[PDB]
Amino acid sequence: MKIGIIGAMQQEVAILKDLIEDVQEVNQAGCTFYSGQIQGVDVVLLQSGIGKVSAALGTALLISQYAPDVVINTGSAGGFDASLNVGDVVISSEVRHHDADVTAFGYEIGQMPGQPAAFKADEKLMTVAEQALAQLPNTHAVRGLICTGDAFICTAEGQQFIRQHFPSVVAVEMEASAIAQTCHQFKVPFVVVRAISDVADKESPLSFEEFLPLAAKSSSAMVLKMVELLKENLYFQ
């Protein structure tokens, strides 16, 4: 099997990049693809750049050229769920665009015409995420709705808008819905396994830069554990 792993920033992909054996690097359209193996499992790690367009473009190139069997989105996120602390893992049940609005034509808030209102994480991948979490007993996680937009959320007004429209939101970021929508269009299973760098408030610019490395560490540990589980999930393969 081949696992596609996608992160936006260099800092988000660095830990996993260093684990790829027999690594081959391709640079294309602002994207970097690292292909090789982890523990005999074929992996392609994409560093896409930030935001919905970069993530969509990168994901489209990843799927069309490398044909991963599954996609895992790694990286940081801004926490909305009360129970999340900085460094904690967040897992997508589903992903929505918080900044999509075609309600004028009867679509629900966040729904892009032509798409479902939410992009559901693959149930079989989800089971692997749960298994990985069970093997990291020091790790606290929350699973729920992840909301994506092309904005860094750092104001009370920004938070309130998102909570008003998506009351179940557990975290926000800037790529997941683009990765998930792209995967939906290609019919490829995905899950988002990120970790919290900040709580999307006026302190988040500073918190983000301070704790991005921690978030990358936590997210990356989970993703590595999933790769190790996938290695011997022969029914899944």
Added chain:
Amino acid sequence: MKIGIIGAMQQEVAILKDLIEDVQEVNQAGCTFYSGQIQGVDVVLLQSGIGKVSAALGTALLISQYAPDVVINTGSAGGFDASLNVGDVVISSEVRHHDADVTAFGYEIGQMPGQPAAFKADEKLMTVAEQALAQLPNTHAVRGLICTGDAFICTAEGQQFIRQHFPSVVAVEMEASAIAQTCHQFKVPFVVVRAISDVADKESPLSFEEFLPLAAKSSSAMVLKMVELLKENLYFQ
């Protein structure tokens, strides 16, 4: 040369689709690609679907698989310039994301990290659009900033925010910045040549329904003239 043409909706691509000789249709990832010739020049017409993610995904597949020499984005738009009536044409000087905001890290409003603040349309393609306009004297057009977001703009608040942050905006729509950013990442020249279906206000939903066909007609006539000029002029090898 090979000319790439991108429209989001069925009605936006239908006029040009019907002019393609020796047409070959490919369906991939929810996109449709029609290739062949229009008046003796190779074209690939992409029906991308609506919104930034679909447009980015589609444009990435278009460029990576078909290698068009230039990209023209056709279709409808919501008018901001006071002189625009339904059916009038807008030509991009440049394109920006109206809904991007990472000002917390020093970027300009609308600027995505890792990108320039605006995506400038190609000078030769703008010239060709202006030549096409001269050959369609009963068409009124404005050249200027086109702003894109994942929302249908139809409220006073929506207009206010966009005008506040991008006061020179001439029109808004939902794909151009995705196309433009993707073309930027691939280093492929682009221009947007759209037409007005509505003026982005409370009347827009009904105006759009009524005037989408007029907007497709007006935009498509310009694009056809541009195809003819590009075949003749050798501006692009």
